[PDB]
Amino acid sequence: GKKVLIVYAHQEPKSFNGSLKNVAVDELSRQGCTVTVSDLYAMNFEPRATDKDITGTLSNPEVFNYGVETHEAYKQRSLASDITDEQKKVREADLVIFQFPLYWFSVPAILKGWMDRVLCQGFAFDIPGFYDSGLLQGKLALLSVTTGGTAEMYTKTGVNGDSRYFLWPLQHGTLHFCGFKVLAPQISFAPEIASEEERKGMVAAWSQRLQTIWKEEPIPCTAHWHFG
Amino acid sequence: GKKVLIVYAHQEPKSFNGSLKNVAVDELSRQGCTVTVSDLYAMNFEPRATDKDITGTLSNPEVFNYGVETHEAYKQRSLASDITDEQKKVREADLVIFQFPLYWFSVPAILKGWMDRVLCQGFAFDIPGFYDSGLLQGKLALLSVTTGGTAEMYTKTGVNGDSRYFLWPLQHGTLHFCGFKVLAPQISFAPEIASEEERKGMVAAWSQRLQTIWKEEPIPCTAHWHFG
Ligand SMILES: Cc1cc2nc3c(=O)[nH]c(=O)nc-3n(C[C@H](O)[C@H](O)[C@H](O)COP(=O)(O)OP(=O)(O)OC[C@H]3O[C@@H](n4cnc5c(N)ncnc54)[C@H](O)[C@@H]3O)c2cc1C
Ligand SMILES: Cc1cc2nc3c(=O)[nH]c(=O)nc-3n(C[C@H](O)[C@H](O)[C@H](O)COP(=O)(O)OP(=O)(O)OC[C@H]3O[C@@H](n4cnc5c(N)ncnc54)[C@H](O)[C@@H]3O)c2cc1C
Ligand SMILES: Cc1ccc(NC(=O)c2ccc(CN3CCN(C)CC3)cc2)cc1Nc1nccc(-c2cccnc2)n1
Ligand SMILES: Cc1ccc(NC(=O)c2ccc(CN3CCN(C)CC3)cc2)cc1Nc1nccc(-c2cccnc2)n1
Ligand SMILES: [Zn+2]
Ligand SMILES: [Zn+2]
């Protein structure tokens, strides 16, 4: 049996993102998958990387270095419980779906904070132990993104550039760095200026794709895939 | 006379980022510039985009859309005071420096939240009124970034890819979209594994560059500059 974690970043249950999230829960649940949703805004999830994230005594009280102290805290089981709650979900998951609207060619800050705080050294990667040897190897990840801009604006000759250009920090710099195999992204362009039937169609496309998600091959997460 | 805003995202005053920020304050202050620092962690700056950001009544209580409601709130002077405090600093600034460590090939979530919440429609851009016609036109912006990875890892043939690849969402998708002219980024690679004298040199390089920052030409912020 499979475990899926959906890390969901939208304020509004009736939003288009909310519908994409609900559809994923329904379809995966129907398949028999174990499903967990981290509804970040509902959780009032803390995005800031601060010394409050380490519940043990710091190694160095003269100079605070977030990466160093969370790495040591992870080894000593001294991380704040909101972080370790999310680590448990990720550790058990076979597939992690991120469901979010694009904010400034990236994830909303609350989701950026989940990346910053949850994927610490010792947990998600180590040195050595990143990219193909990252510590989340054997898991799948997939970005389900919605945009303001249209598909045609997100091409090589459109004002926004190819949509693969903005995926690079998330897919390569984050997911692949932690050792995930990355499934092709689901990009739902410009729902706000689409018709209600068009929105209906983009939702159904997602639901349909999920019916056979476990049969998909990951993408080659390389500079060539993104910029070639 | 010139106004500079430094949006600074580091938890530790004695950090390498803290030193780069302090050097900027000292040098710009010595030049006679008006200098403001938004020390995000010290301000406990709120990164989450929520309905609390709108202090007026929502246009639509059935379905909450953050972009729509902040755009209307901006027009009606009904945004939370932490946002409008930052908008005042940006509105008056001639140069905005972002000083931050790279987190997951991007900005720390607290700074991502300052982008998400501060640069709202009507203020930073409109439709129409983006990229070259963005509403912050006539201002300069500059990213001062520090990394874990080495310069050689951040090349086309290194594991991280060229550093220009990760700059794309920040420089093109955000700064240029709002109409900033973008100065060449300052990238201080791998201070943590550099020697103390090397760190000293990278600090002095920044200080020296700032002596003539007002004489620099902006970069062409294009797909070609980033991926060419
Ligand atoms: C801070 C910020 C930064 C942004 N940065 C960018 C950027 O860099 N690039 C870019 O392109 N865009 C950007 N945007 C735009 C953003 O990506 C979009 O507004 C977002 O993707 C839209 O998704 P949504 O879920 O909120 O849509 P919604 O507004 O919720 O969707 C539209 C309508 O569809 C309805 N709906 C819900 N479910 C269904 C259904 N099943 N069938 C039919 N209709 C349904 C909803 O109720 C809603 O009224 C930014 C927005 C913000 C606020
Ligand atoms: C969540 C997270 C995500 C990350 N993601 C990435 C990523 O995607 N890519 C990547 O490359 N890296 C990443 N990193 C690494 C991160 O970018 C670095 O740790 C950061 O850039 C280092 O800067 P710092 O200011 O914290 O250095 P510091 O640790 O503060 O600098 C090193 C030492 O220099 C000292 N110092 C201060 N001032 C001076 C001075 N004037 N002269 C000499 N020494 C001085 C400090 O006190 C310190 O002890 C990530 C880190 C975290 C926590
Ligand atoms: C919340 C919202 C909803 C939709 C959009 N839409 C677009 O940004 C957009 C802009 C121009 C067009 C061009 N189109 C030409 C034809 N006429 C009829 C419509 C306009 C289409 C979509 C933005 C937002 N808000 C928003 N907020 C912050 C940043 C951005 C953003 C940033 C970078 C690139 N694109 C958008 N966007
Ligand atoms: C807080 C910190 C400080 C430094 C680094 N350093 C590096 O990630 C790194 C990794 C490998 C090398 C290779 N080097 C080979 C030679 N031997 C001697 C040293 C290792 C250098 C730097 C990471 C972190 N933490 C951190 N936390 C989350 C994500 C990332 C991150 C993400 C993507 C790419 N690079 C780093 N990094
Ligand atoms: Zn990759
Ligand atoms: Zn540009």
Author numbering:
A (entry chain A), B (entry chain A): 2 to 229
From the reporting publication:
We have solved the X-ray crystal structure of NQO2 bound to imatinib to 1.75 Å resolution, which shows that the drug is bound adjacent to the flavin isoalloxazine ring. The final model includes residues 3–230 of human NQO2, one FAD molecule, one imatinib molecule, one zinc atom, two (4R)-2-methylpentane-2,4-diol (MRD) molecules, and 213 solvent molecules. In our structure, the dimer is formed from two adjacent molecules related by a crystallographic 2-fold axis. Steric constraints prevent the bound imatinib from binding in an extended conformation, causing it to instead adopt a horseshoe shape that directs the methylbenzene, benzamide, and N-methylpiperazine rings (rings C, D and E) away from the active site and towards the solvent. The inhibitor makes no direct hydrogen bonds with the protein, although several water-mediated hydrogen bonds are observed. A water-mediated hydrogen bond is formed between Asn 161, which is positioned by a hydrogen-bonding interaction with Tyr 132, and the N3 nitrogen of the imatinib pyridine ring (ring A). The conformation of the imatinib molecule in complex with NQO2 resembles this cis conformation.
NQO2 is a cytosolic flavoprotein that carries out the 2-electron reduction of quinones using electron donors such as nicotinamide riboside (NRH). It is one of two closely related cellular quinone reductases (the other being NQO1) and is thought to be involved in metabolic reduction and xenobiotic detoxification, although its precise physiological role remains uncertain. Dimerization leads to formation of two FAD-containing active sites per dimer, with each active site located in a deep pocket at the interface between monomers.
